[PDB]
Design a protein around this ligand. Sequence first.
Ligand code: FAD
Ligand code: NAP
Length: 531
Amino acid sequence: RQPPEEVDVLVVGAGFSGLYALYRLRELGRSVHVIETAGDVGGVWYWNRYPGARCDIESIEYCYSFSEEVLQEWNWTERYASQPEILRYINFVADKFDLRSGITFHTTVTAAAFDEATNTWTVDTNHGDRIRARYLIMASGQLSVPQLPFPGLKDFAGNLYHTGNWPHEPVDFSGQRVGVIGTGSSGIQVSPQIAKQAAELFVFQRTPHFAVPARNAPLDPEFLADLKKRYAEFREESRNTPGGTHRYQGPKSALEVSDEELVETLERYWQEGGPDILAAYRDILRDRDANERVAEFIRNKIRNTVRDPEVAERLVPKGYPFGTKKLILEIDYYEMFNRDNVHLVDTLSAPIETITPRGVRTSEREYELDSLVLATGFDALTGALFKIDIRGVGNVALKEKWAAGPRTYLGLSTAGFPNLFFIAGPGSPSALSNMLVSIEQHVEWVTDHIAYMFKNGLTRSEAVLEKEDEWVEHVNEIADETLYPMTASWYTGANVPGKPRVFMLYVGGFHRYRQICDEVAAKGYEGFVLT
Ligand SMILES: Cc1cc2nc3c(=O)[nH]c(=O)nc-3n(C[C@H](O)[C@H](O)[C@H](O)COP(=O)(O)OP(=O)(O)OC[C@H]3O[C@@H](n4cnc5c(N)ncnc54)[C@H](O)[C@@H]3O)c2cc1C
Ligand SMILES: NC(=O)c1ccc[n+]([C@@H]2O[C@H](COP(=O)([O-])OP(=O)(O)OC[C@H]3O[C@@H](n4cnc5c(N)ncnc54)[C@H](OP(=O)(O)O)[C@@H]3O)[C@@H](O)[C@H]2O)c1
């Protein structure tokens, strides 16, 4: 295509966030355009084409709600949508609303500066494009910059993959000795798929993550047709929860119940499948003794599923509270370790020294491999922004304002960078809820804000320093009543060497955050200085 020279709003990213922003700003009567590195729309579901890639929120929850047409027409097929289906869904939405005409593909934003003279952003690309825009909306994702973990890497003679940059043609592992590094949810999803083709699968686990069974199933078309009659009502229920989904909020303490009640209640969640067990009790994420009561139950289920108790014990998560890393939904992951051709390489015990040209050496031995898959995650939440040279007032780099951790007012803007907005990022609920609920709310609040600026004749919107300071403090304070900050997770930035350890997300629940945001808007955007 080709980016316009001037535009009311420039949006970066064509995944869920950017698509909705483009749609809604058009509907608001604004000129808007999108720059996207990828060859086409989808964002994470464009990039994460590893086999077994699948959402952990139910298909009926994980979808747009802005368009009645879309809710009535689209049919989901399974409890949880695999990546191809979600990508087909996003394509369907792009077509329906003709979004591709406002998007330049194959183009990476590399810099952006705020010009105080004009109250506009100047944005440059890796193609030479230079765009002038009143407002800049960063919809560049939360888990969109692959993290490659390092000594022997470029030496590897075989094929090298990262799950977050998977080839667009399916990949044949038939006959191969294959290694996976990462047992986060990417590796836990990709591994049983690989184990079916490979002669030998080596799973390189470091800290074992908690996974519970997904128990995927066909989605009954009769249930779907029924749900469609009440869909807006149903999504509205989802928006009035902490997590953006129909999870039941267990009112009891995990400490108050008897042993027999605990086992029974949790057994029920384990048979049902899904992530809801995370809210079986109100204090699982607040109190270390409540947490441990749940964690031990799960731990015993793991020892149950694997026949060799030596391998079994190696898969049991230790050292950190259940649910403080992302909780993972597994499909046949544990059962896979009972196969003859799958070997758990415990690297807490025998750390990876180096990659060789033949494979991977740990302290203990060398494993030869034809293919190596990195399921090693992402430079989360800040990674995409930090890959861009972004400059605010007095030429402050964002990289510098945020060097000790991200600093925002509501997660939506940062002081000294006016007219710039982050969609579903640090300082807001983000990945702690159903992201379609997080993303829709932010797109609507930001684009309402833009509309309100234009109608009132204003051209400059900035967060007030002391409000940002109060916001950061409040985020840290509420985070500090949970067990989240106790643990090294991507939420904490802890998977990136050198990255400052700070819990980056709002933990007070989607619903409360949204109230705070509405109260702000209704007061003429309190905490913002508009001129
Ligand atoms: C594999 C995977 C599975 C997921 N499963 C769940 C799920 O179970 N539940 C859920 O709630 N969330 C899920 N997510 C989280 C996911 O981030 C959100 O649900 C949502 O897809 C993100 O939407 P987005 O548009 O904000 O970001 P993205 O989908 O990441 O889109 C951002 C786009 O911007 C592009 N971009 C970045 N920087 C630049 C730049 N410099 N110039 C041009 N383009 C740029 C990126 O290439 C990307 O295409 C999962 C994430 C991953 C990685
Ligand atoms: N179905 C889904 O919902 C789904 C699927 C995929 C992704 N996601 C989203 O994206 C996030 C990322 O998931 P992910 O699995 O890609 O990444 P991750 O959760 O960031 O897991 C990275 C994995 O790689 C390991 N690792 C990283 N660096 C390493 C190193 N230098 N040496 C050895 N091991 C290393 C980590 O070990 P340690 O744990 O010990 O650090 C962990 O096993 C998820 O938590 C979730 O938010 C969701």
